[PDB]
Each structure stands twice: as C-alpha cells, then as structure tokens.
C-alpha cells in the first residue's frame, strides 16, 4: 500500500517552565508583638537558617530555567517589511503593532484563557524576564526559521527563500521535491487553514500551565490557617497567654507554640523542593524541544508532535511555552502487487531505495512515501550478481536508454 | 516593598545609591524585574535597563541564498556532574554517648534509627 | 558543619553536655531535660537525611544526562543538533575529573559566507530540471551548483540533476541551456 | 560487510589534479563507458 495524498496537521504541546517564587521569613511568621517569643527562638535559630538557605535556592533555579530555554540565540531577529512568501500567510504569529504590548495575536489569545499575604511575612519575589522581554526571543526564533530554517542558531546567519527552504525539508522523511514545485497550491491552502483551526480551537488543553498556579497558591493559604491553631493548647495569640497566665508561668506554652510552626514550616519547604525537581526536570525537558524541534528537524519518531516533523513555532505563554508543530501524516492508501527483484537475461536488477509495483499490465518503480509511476531503467536498478541466487524473483524486461542512443 | 541622595523607584523596589541612566548594556548583576545593575561611568554604581543582545535586521528576498565559502574550527568545554562524596551518621554515637538513661530514651525510637 | 553545631545548641533546655545535666541534677528529675535534648536531635538528622535524598536525585538525574554524552557524542556521530555543543558536532574527547567529567567537543561553525542569485528550476527543452543534492547558484551571467555548505563552482549537467514532467508546473522558473556532457560523447 | 567492486568511472568522480593530495597512489582505471559505445 502507498499513500496517494497528503494532508497538513499542527498539534500543540505544553510544557511548563517556570512558576511564581515565594519567600517565607522564618522569623516573622513564627512570633510577632512579643518580647520572650524571640529569645526562644535564639535556641532554634539553626533551623532558620537551613529553611532560608532552601527557599532561596529555588528562587534562583527559577531564573536559570528561563536563560535555557528562552536564550538560544545571540542577536535579536526582526520581521522582514515584505509579506511575500509564495502563497503562504505569516500575521498570525508576528507581533501586532497595533497591540500595545510587544506580542502576536496567538501569545494573547492564551492569555486570556490563563486566569494579602504579606500582612505576616509572605511576599512574592519578581521575576527577572517580564512579559515584554520573553516576547522579543520568540520573535527572533519565528524570524529566523522564515530567513535561514537551521543556519541561524550555531553559526553565521544564512539568508535562503521559504521557496527552497520547504524542499529540504521533505528529504529527511523520503517525499521527493517534484511534489512540492507541482502541488504548490495545495499545501499553500492546507497551511493557512490549520492555523485557522487551532485559533478557534484554543479561543473556546491549557489545563496544565493553571494546574501549576492552584498548587502552589494552595500551599499559601495553608499556613494561614496555621495561625488559628492551638497546636494542643488554648490559645493561638502570643498576646493572650501573657495575658491570663503569669510570665514565669507561660514558657510551657509558648515553647509548644514555637515548635509547633517549626513542623508546619518544615512540611512546607520539604514540599516545595520536592516540586521543584517537576520543575527543573520540565525545564530541561522543555529546551531539548526548543534546541532540537524548532531548531533543525530532528527525525526521532514521535518526539516533535504526531508524524513527520518539519517545522516548529515558539509561543510564548505564562510560565510556559507552547509549541505548534507541523506534522506531515499521509492520506488513503491503494493496494498493488510487489516484487522483490527483477530479473532479465540473468541479471539481478535490486533498486536503489525503493519498490517496484504493479499497475497490473506493466510494471513500475516508485518510493515508498508518494507513488510515482516511472518507467523501469537502468539508471534505478542495478546489478548485484545470479538470478539463481535468490529465491522468489520474477522475470521481466529491462528498458535500457543507451540503446536508442546508439542507433 | 517599600514605595519611593540618588533615589530610583523602579517596578522592583527602590535602590537607593544609583543612578538612572539614558543608556542600555548588558546585564551584570542580576537585581529583579529585568534591571541589572553594574559599575560603569568616574565609574560608579548606576541602574539601567538589561540588553538582549545587538538588534540586527537580517536581509529576506526571495531569489538569493547565503553559500558559506570558509570554515573554522572550535572546541568547547561542558562540565557535568557524575557523583558526590559518601558520609554516613550514626544514631546512639552522635546523639548519646558515655551515658546510661540516654540509650533508654532512645529505645522508644528505635524504628527510627533503623 | 551543621549537626557540629547540634550539639552545642540547648533547644530550649539548660545545658548541652549529656554528662554536665547528670552531674548536677538526679537522674529521675533529668528525664524532662534529655527528652528534649533527643527530640531537638531528632529532627536534625531527619532534616539531615531528607536533604541528602534530594541532591541523590539530582545526582542520578543528571547521571542518566552525562551517560548520554558518553553513548551519542563520543561513541559515534551524534545526529541531535544543539545537543553536543555549539554547531555540527563531529567527534569527542572524553576526559577524567575528581567528582565529575569535563568533554571537549568539535563542532563545525561556519565562517565567512556570500550571496549569489539562486533558481529554484532549470528549465531546457521544455523539461523541468530539478537537482537532487545541490542548489542552483549564479554570478550574473553564468549559472552553476554547488553544495548547502560548501561553495565549488560546478558545470550544469545531466547527471547531478533529473526531468520531472514540462516547466508549465512551477510559479517561478528561469530557462538555461543544458551543456550535457552525453552529447559530446555521441557525435 | 566484504562486497568487492570493479574500479569504475560511475563510482568515482574528478576533483582537480593530483599533485594537490599529499596521498595518492596509481592505478589505470577499466572506465566502462568505452566498451559501451563501440
């Protein structure tokens, strides 16, 4: 069976990258308005200060998650002014200058979709790349994969037209190049209509990057509720115990109250370096398909979508990035009659890389990616030995060009 | 978090002992929501916004291709991690030692040293 | 250095020194101040512990990545782009460090490049001459073909490139005559 | 795998002269397209 049609497919991945970085203060949360509480603490001071040194370790992993995979390139890439690149339409992913923001249209659509606590010591930290700097590195991969395909990001810029630039890109699967030049308008139609399908796709999945946000904002109202706990006493106010009880009477009750947010802290900064490893090991895994997908085409089945890889575009998203590849999956099969060889006047025929099929009254030779009826000759077959040798070998003719040439 | 000689209110929080400058360079020292930092003129410690490299604009057409002519060679250097080193701690020699009533304590934790 | 300074620390008790605690006070008023000496111990070898299971797994996790290195950069022409360093890798030089493992790669970056007027199709008695490796170069007269990576100047001829059908099937091709080496040969 | 092959002008191709490469031996190649033609 070989396929007679083809047919274009983008799919879409999440991989997430970063998430929010926060900042217990170990010293705050614990006591407030009271003098004895921070003499207490003095013996467990230890304990702070591996808490603290663990909570900003992952406030500066976040960062180099994003100098991987957001920083493949060196020099900052633009658009090209002339919108011509052979039937073929490009807006969707370049950034519109009539948005106030530095973005395209599909980084937008998804932000749409994706939807107090420093009153006792629970501030946020600030990323280092804000919204408008992320978007300038996708802007210079989507530039220059239309300007130079995979000669932009390890060398030299190379400057080549999307006209050839498509062709050698099915020599990696098998697909000849004289099906690009003749069925031009085709794939040019099949190219802006699924790009038309993914926006309305994604305009009504994204459940991965805002699963991210409710775990880690569901850690932060946890430890408030710590604070309304007596943790196995009466009270949960470090004005109240020096209140009804004396002070030399109230150091077995502060004591509990210490130790118990030592537990409640502890529990949280073990979890959090626990997710943290989901983190890095989505964020290294998020730039193999950054260095390998979108730049180059990489011929590991099933690594860059569903299908033949052949191209990739970058977008950018809330601590995420989301790629659309562009699978290549053929279309309908018909069902011939091979052959394993080709024997003449005793000669072993073998083809050079394809199979030979069967019209029913003649014989062909074609590829095994798209059919191609072509006339039997010697500039496809060679020989290699017997017709004894091999078992199973039908006999035909062998048309032979240098025979008319020399009457 | 705290709203604001050489006072600079920026969207990461006020540092107080730069300057603000017209230009732009590269990032130094890394300081938060893409400002960075450096000791530049004379020289002084001045705030300024982080570069992303030199903005070029590379020539489209659609009927010239770049062909390279020359060809050199380099050699990088990666350093990977393989292992670290192998401490082990013991339970009654570092919490107990020359004591009796402190191995008795312990047997009730006993799991916890296995 | 840490669990050093474990023993020194009091955990809100009186003293540290297992054996200064039972010099100055009887053995069964001393039960409320070991217990919270153990107890103050307890969680720093558990804390301990927990941290070193954490970088074991950043240990075994980036020793699955140095192994990788070893298995498609040095053995054998590693075919992943952007993976072996910087450029089109070729081959490695493993070599030892204490705790770790420094490679030295060789990668293939270009240099200094041209620009040259490129065709898509050759077109010559009405047969649309597509080329099967190379790419259709120009110096404003003359045409040739060279490689994708390397410029050599080469003659059009027949047997670098083959017909597919009339040139009526293509939006933009230019018209050149063939020399075809094979008709000198027949005459 | 051992597959033995006649030293043919098919399987090779010219690239400049032969003074340019420091190794290089000497060997008078069969070249098919003579028998082919007559």
Same mark, same amino acid.
């Given at each position: 069976a070989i396929p007679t049609?083809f047919?274009?497919? %983008?799919?879409?991945? &999440?991989?997430?990258?970063?998430?929010?970085?926060?900042?217990?203060?170990?010293?705050? $949360?614990?006591?407030?308005?009271?003098?004895?509480?921070?003499?207490?603490?003095?013996? #467990?001071?230890?304990?702070?200060?591996?808490?603290?040194?663990?909570?900003?370790?992952?406030?500066?992993?976040?960062?180099?998650?994003?100098?991987?995979?957001?920083?493949? %390139?060196?020099?900052? #890439?633009?658009?090209?002014? &002339?919108?011509?690149?052979?039937?073929?339409?490009?807006?969707?992913?370049?950034?519109?200058?009539? =948005?106030?923001?530095?973005? @395209?249209?599909?980084?937008?659509?998804?932000?749409? =979709?994706?939807?107090?606590?420093?009153?006792?010591?629970?501030? %946020?930290?600030?990323?280092?790349?804000?919204?408008?700097?992320?978007?300038? #590195?996708?802007?210079?991969?989507?530039?220059?994969?239309?300007?130079?395909?995979?000669?932009?990001?390890?060398?030299?810029?190379?400057?080549?037209?999307?006209?050839?630039?498509?062709a050698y890109r099915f020599n990696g699967i098998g697909v000849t190049q004289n099906v690009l $030049?003749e069925?031009? =308008?085709?794939?040019?139609?099949?190219?802006?209509?699924?790009?038309?399908?993914?926006? +309305?796709?994604?305009?009504?999945?994204?459940? =991965?990057?805002?699963?991210?946000?409710?775990?880690?904002?569901?850690?932060?109202?946890?430890?408030?509720?710590?604070? @309304? @706990?007596?943790?196995?006493?009466?009270?949960?106010?470090?004005?109240?115990?020096? @209140?009804?009880?004396?002070?030399?009477?109230?150091?077995?009750?502060?004591?509990?109250? &210490?130790?118990?947010?030592?537990?409640?802290?502890?529990? #949280?900064?073990?979890?959090?370096?626990?997710?943290?490893?989901?983190?890095?090991?989505?964020?290294?895994?998020?730039?193999?398909?950054?260095?390998?997908?979108?730049?180059?085409q990489?011929k590991?089945v +099933?690594?860059?979508?569903?299908?033949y890889?052949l191209?990739?575009?970058?977008?950018?998203?809330?601590?995420?990035?989301?790629?659309?590849? %562009?699978?290549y999956?053929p279309?309908?099969e018909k069902?011939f009659t091979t052959a394993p060889a080709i024997c003449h006047?005793?000669k072993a025929h073998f083809p050079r890389e394809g199979v030979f099929v069967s019209?029913?009254?003649?014989w062909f030779v074609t590829q095994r990616n798209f059919y191609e009826p072509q006339i039997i000759t010697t500039d496809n077959t060679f020989v290699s030995g017997?017709? +004894?040798?091999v &078992?199973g070998i039908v006999?035909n003719?062998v048309y032979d060009p240098?025979?008319?040439?020399? +009457? | 978090?705290?709203?604001?000689?050489?006072?600079?209110?920026?969207?990461?929080?006020?540092?107080?002992?730069?300057?603000?400058?017209?230009?732009?360079?590269? /990032?130094?020292?890394?300081? *938060?929501?893409?400002?960075?930092?450096?000791?530049?003129?004379?020289?002084?410690?001045?705030?300024?916004?982080?570069?992303? *490299?030199?903005?070029?604009?590379?020539?489209?057409?659609?009927?010239?291709?770049?062909?390279?002519?020359?060809?050199?060679?380099?050699?990088?250097?990666?350093?990977?991690?393989?292992?670290?080193?192998?401490?082990?701690?013991?339970?009654?020699?570092?919490? /107990?030692?020359?004591?009796?009533?402190?191995?008795?304590?312990?047997?009730?934790? *006993?799991?916890? /040293?296995?």
């Amino acid at each position: 069976a070989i396929p007679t049609n083809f047919t274009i497919s %983008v799919t879409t991945e &999440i991989l997430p990258v970063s998430m929010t970085k926060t900042s217990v203060d170990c010293t705050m $949360y614990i006591c407030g308005d009271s003098t004895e509480c921070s003499n207490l603490l003095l013996q #467990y001071g230890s304990f702070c200060t591996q808490l603290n040194r663990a909570l900003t370790g992952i406030a500066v992993e976040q960062d180099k998650n994003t100098q991987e995979v957001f920083a493949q %390139v060196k020099q900052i #890439y633009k658009t090209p002014p &002339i919108k011509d690149f052979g039937g073929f339409n490009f807006s969707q992913i370049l950034p519109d200058p009539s =948005k106030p923001s530095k973005r @395209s249209f599909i980084e937008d659509l998804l932000f749409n =979709k994706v939807t107090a606590q420093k009153f006792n010591g629970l501030t %946020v930290l600030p990323p280092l790349l804000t919204d408008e700097m992320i978007a300038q #590195y996708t802007s210079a991969l989507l530039a220059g994969t239309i300007t130079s395909g995979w000669t932009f990001g390890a060398g030299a810029a190379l400057q080549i037209p999307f006209a050839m630039q498509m062709a050698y890109r099915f020599n990696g699967i098998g697909v000849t190049q004289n099906v690009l $030049y003749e069925n031009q =308008k085709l794939i040019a139609n099949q190219f802006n209509s699924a790009i038309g399908k993914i926006q +309305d796709s994604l305009s009504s999945a994204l459940g =991965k990057l805002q699963d991210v946000v409710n775990q880690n904002a569901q850690a932060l109202n946890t430890l408030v509720k710590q604070l @309304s @706990s007596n943790f196995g006493a009466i009270s949960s106010v470090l004005n109240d115990i020096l @209140s009804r009880l004396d002070p030399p009477e109230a150091e077995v009750q502060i004591d509990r109250l &210490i130790t118990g947010r030592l537990q409640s802290l502890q529990t #949280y900064v073990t979890q959090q370096l626990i997710r943290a490893a989901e983190i890095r090991a989505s964020a290294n895994l998020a730039a193999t398909k950054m260095s390998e997908c979108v730049l180059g085409q990489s011929k590991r089945v +099933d690594f860059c979508g569903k299908g033949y890889h052949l191209m990739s575009f970058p977008q950018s998203a809330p601590h995420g990035v989301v790629f659309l590849h %562009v699978t290549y999956v053929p279309a309908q099969e018909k069902n011939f009659t091979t052959a394993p060889a080709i024997c003449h006047d005793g000669k072993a025929h073998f083809p050079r890389e394809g199979v030979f099929v069967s019209n029913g009254t003649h014989w062909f030779v074609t590829q095994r990616n798209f059919y191609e009826p072509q006339i039997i000759t010697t500039d496809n077959t060679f020989v290699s030995g017997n017709c +004894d040798v091999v &078992i199973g070998i039908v006999n035909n003719t062998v048309y032979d060009p240098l025979q008319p040439e020399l +009457d | 978090d705290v709203n604001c000689s050489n006072v600079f209110q920026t969207r990461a929080g006020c540092l107080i002992g730069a300057e603000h400058v017209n230009n732009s360079y590269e /990032c130094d020292i890394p300081i *938060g929501a893409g400002i960075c930092a450096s000791y530049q003129t004379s020289q002084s410690i001045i705030a300024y916004t982080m570069s992303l *490299g030199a903005e070029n604009s590379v020539a489209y057409s659609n009927n010239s291709i770049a062909i390279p002519t020359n060809f050199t060679i380099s050699v990088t250097t990666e350093i990977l991690p393989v292992s670290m080193t192998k401490t082990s701690v013991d339970c009654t020699m570092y919490i /107990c030692g020359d004591s009796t009533e402190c191995s008795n304590l312990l047997l009730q934790y *006993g799991s916890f /040293c296995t």
